[PDB]
Amino acid sequence: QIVNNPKQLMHEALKLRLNLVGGMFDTVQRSTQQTTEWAMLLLEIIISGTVDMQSNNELFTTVLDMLSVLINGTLANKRAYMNLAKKLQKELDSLEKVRQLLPLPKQTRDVITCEPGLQVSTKQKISPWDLFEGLKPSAPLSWGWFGTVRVDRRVARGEEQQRLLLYHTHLRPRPRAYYLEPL
Amino acid sequence: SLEDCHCNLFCLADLTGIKWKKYVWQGPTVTEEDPILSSFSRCLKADVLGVWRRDQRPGRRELWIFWWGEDPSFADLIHHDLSEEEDGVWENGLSYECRTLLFKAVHNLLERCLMNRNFVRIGKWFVKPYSEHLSCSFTFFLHGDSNVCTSVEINQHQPVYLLSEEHITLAQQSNSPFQVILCPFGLNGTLTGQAFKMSDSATKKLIGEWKQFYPISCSLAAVEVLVAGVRMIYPACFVLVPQSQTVDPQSVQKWVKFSSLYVNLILSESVMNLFKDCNFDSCCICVCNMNIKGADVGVYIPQEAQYRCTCGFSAVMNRKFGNNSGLFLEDELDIIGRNTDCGKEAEKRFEALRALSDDLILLLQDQCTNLFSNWVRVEERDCCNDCYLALEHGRQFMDALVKSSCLHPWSKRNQCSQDILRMLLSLQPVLQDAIQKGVQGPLTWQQFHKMAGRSPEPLPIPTFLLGYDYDYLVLSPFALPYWERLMLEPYGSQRDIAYVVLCPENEALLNGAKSFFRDLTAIYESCRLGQHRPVSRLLTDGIMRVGSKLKLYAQVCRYDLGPYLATMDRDKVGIPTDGDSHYPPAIVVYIIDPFTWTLGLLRCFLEMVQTLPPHIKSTVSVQIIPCQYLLQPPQHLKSLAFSAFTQCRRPLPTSTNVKTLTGFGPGLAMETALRSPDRPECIRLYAPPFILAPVKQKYNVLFVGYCLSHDQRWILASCTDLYGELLETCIINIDVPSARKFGLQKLWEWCLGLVQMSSLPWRVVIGRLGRIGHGELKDWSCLLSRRNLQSLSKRLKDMCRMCGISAADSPSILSACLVAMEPQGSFVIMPDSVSQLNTPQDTSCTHILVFPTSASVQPNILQQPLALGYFVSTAKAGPLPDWFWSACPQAQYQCPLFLKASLHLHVPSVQSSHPLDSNQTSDVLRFVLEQYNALSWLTCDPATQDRRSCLPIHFVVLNQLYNFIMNML
Amino acid sequence: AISETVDPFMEWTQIITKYLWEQLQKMAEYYRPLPHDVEVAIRQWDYTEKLAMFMFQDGMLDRHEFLTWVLECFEKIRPGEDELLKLLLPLLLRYSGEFVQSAYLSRRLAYFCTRRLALQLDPFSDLLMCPQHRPLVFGLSCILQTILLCCPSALGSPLDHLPIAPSNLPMPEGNSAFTQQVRAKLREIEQQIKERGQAVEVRWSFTIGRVLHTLEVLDSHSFERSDFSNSLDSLCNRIFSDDDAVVSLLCEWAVSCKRSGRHRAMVVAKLLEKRQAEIEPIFQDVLLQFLDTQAPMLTDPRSESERVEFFNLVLLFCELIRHDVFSHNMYTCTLISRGDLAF
């Protein structure tokens, strides 16, 4: 009902539920896979935007406390900790606090493919171990991602204009100190 | 993209078929007898658009009535003595005066409806008394040919409580005066506590008269309140009572350490009567009379007889944006007034802000050339000076303190995207009912762009030019972070650099220097930027050591570096010598700065250059690196490597090596022409790492922008080419204790000096970083006149024979243009609300929209804004000068910036198809703004994913130069 | 290529940690009985650590495993070996940015940091004199401050072992303003976590039930058998927030005087009457104002039950005065001063 939708009457409707699971947390940690089953339930209701910082500053804090020792209950196995960490991230300012509970993730370089007016289409992820300068061509990178075109060399436009100026003999410019003088 | 994000806009109504009539009264040189107020209240109850105002002639007041379709009953709503003087329809044209009055008429009905929905008004704000309780302010503008639109500004304010019996009880026992918010206009008053009862005879009549104009609910009735030392009985329904990024600095600190109805009736004709089109914010001198005063402002601002100001100027709003914004002191004082009050405060502040060598300044502006590096508002005083007029007018009927705190500071005392849009959809029914008694909700950019009567797609991303092989390469700007992996090469042929480092004799700082520059050499050479080896003489890895202590830092600095810069071949036997066959390396002096002043360090460079032979001095550069980089915490190395390469500026050769070996010939003719006295010295050609790729006679476009420093003593200017090939900056001294016309003449000479060094016709587009003045427009119109630009074309022909034969080679000027950039501060777009990639997080986008912005519908200077265009950009803008955001400081922090670009001169086809030569002023802006976006992509830091800052590159360098002068001076 | 006939992040991170683990062992045992092998270790420790830092910024080796090894090296530091610790403190400052992005690592780091600070005290003024202990205290206090500021979800709590609050922890010198601002932010955030921890202490779950707790302990035996433990000789000898909780216990039985028991209802009056018996300045308050509100049905004297139950209260009121709990001299001087200002 909340996700498809008496402005704030449902907030207290859930803090009693928080008191329910606050009472029966000790029952939850007794089993092994039952730790996850009501761990995941509260995830989908938080991420939906049912509660934000402006609604109840303390409300958000209360669910976090429960979340720390559900994860601390994994260690006290470590592997079970990872077993659920991969199952928690597989779905995904308020997000800053949520991700702090999970472990540090692996980072990969991202390249932005333009694919042409000349707009941007997609983004590609490449591991940082494939980017080395020993190979002459680009193995992970493709030149067609950036819309590369090879064009023949030409003399610089600025250099040529200096040469063509020799036939003109216009007025001599100011010594660049004429501007920084009293009026 | 932002083509589906929600704005805060509402297409209120359509002006087709509208009709209006004007009724005028003349009086002597009680509200029931008055015909203007009796008719205004009577038509307001019937819910028809009505508005009244005063006229220049004393004792003259006029009432306007707007309606749609069928006429209302005019035999009853109009008093007997009132006589009409104007009967117009939409097909007969809508002047600006009518346009500004229609906006207030809509706001009159809108204000009435809002108070019926439990909204209380405090000045410009409408808030709900006790988050989804947010204050919203309405401003109007006419968008499109005939559609009338509004923009809602939503802000967070502290809670406000309606006055009740409980509040009064504690006031009587309180010795201190009780502070409360009064009126729809937010007056500041003290609650005396002498509450009234509705049964009283006085409040029977007082409330009865109040109900005629404002909708008052229906028990407490009224209360005595004292405002600004003047007491008055005021109804208790309208009274209100108020409620009354570090981790990095900290850890850096650590690293450093260890290593009454009559009164409110008059006010509504002065404070809220000003409801003008927001498109005409960028305006200047009145074209009709060549003055800064016009329209009906002669009655709102304290003779001369202006005649029929048809244009859209409004001096009331001119003083708002032209008080602290970057303007010439000569132009600003005209807007305010020297003889009147507040003229001395501006002069006193300017002098108090103030309270060396010429060649030092020239060195300073060379370092910023590279691509990589209170006052009470006048409009507020106007409201305070309006209190005295209204209160003294009101007090007469009954028979410094006021200017200080007449108005409650609640409106001056200060988010999320979901909650804001919740109120925006909440406000749609209110707007729907008010006009109807349809309206589109918060418009997306696509809907906003579609009804402008003119594509909502983002501007295309330009491609760059690089060198992969010995040939060129057209590459996307997103491939810059992989410069080393793809082994690309820049322009300028990899200039070679030999460096000297000055380091103190501290082991901790010495050891770090060797490793840092060893890493710098690797990244410099890994990129195809050339060779970064030190000076060929080997003295302990090319590091020179030194040894209050700045004096010790200078003696060895000058005594050592001054003079310093002033047959077996086993493997060679196999290969023969190639032959004699047919560019000295640049010298860079790296300076480490132990100090956490700097000029003390730059004083070496001033002393070294004078004691050096000319050929060595022509290529010598200085770089200063702080000592904290070596010790404490890489993207710094890539930025430093590219900055050093860009600053090289390889000099033009002084000899051709023809070896004529004969009396005379074509080779000698080039040589003797190369050494002519009129040829300038130190050409110093500029070659950047990359330039914009060309896009399909020959010409060029010069983009120049300028702004004054924090003091008006200096004019800072910068320039760039169409493709970013050239980039130069200038500083002009204007310090007189006429003062600006000479300064602008020097600037125009500098711009003329650049175009005349080429051999192809140019096009000039002039930009202004801030708001254009009212005198600068007059001065620029004289310099950039048709007669003038044509005259210098003929004067050029006389001097040069070569220009005489071929006109395609003479560096004449084909067109001129003046454009001013300033923020808007009225519209806001939230990227979070929608309707594969998420634009604001990982990409930069930019949309534009330009329209002719005519003053009315259906000699040298025409109307003030010729054409106007919005500049919506997701990418952040750099640190702008403080006066840039003075008008609308709230828009400074929003992520998608709104900027306004205006046209002022547009001199087309001087010599007699490019967009700059089209007489349609809308085509000129979309060409200038499109090139403004394209030049903004040259700011993409190779160490960074996207462009570091918004706008054109020339604007960005000018801003960097402004802060550099500000910080060190 | 040859192994084609595996995550590079995990394997290459393990090699560096194993290689760097050997360097620390060499340095530690050689300081206690300069040797040449230390210089060989020092050069390789200095360079390889700088190489690992660069690869960390490049994101080439796994962050979680590398950071986990760092804390394992910081928990093996011998007690009192500040020197060895000092050559490792800059590792914390360099990697302080990514420590606050996880709660597992911050909790491990805070418990290491809090315990170490307590050992050094047995305060800050004497330590700052020593050039050796000058950066350690500031380094340790700064890493603890930035943990809660950016990562509050990681804080029973590590702060339990620390006797001093982070609000008044020693701070680097220089700016008076900045230091005061950050101190205010730190103290308010510390209070935020202090109340959050209390809230979690009750697992997200007054005076009437207190007597019911004491009812069952007497009910374990027979009430007829007057045991030896009801007397205060055992209670007061082994002992001498109980005064504030016992004022309700005496009065609640007193108003419910329909139950009997008088000669066994004075032993608890002996407990708290001795604290105020030596008076012959402060005065016990809010006592008599409570009781006169609980007087029921004063308007109607037709019912005899409201009279005799109130008559029992006066007898309870008479006997409590002789126990000397409600003082009279400071009460009557207020009554003396009540009419003095009226005249």
Ligand SMILES: [Zn+2]
């Ligand atoms: Zn010429």
Ligand SMILES: [Zn+2]
């Ligand atoms: Zn005009």
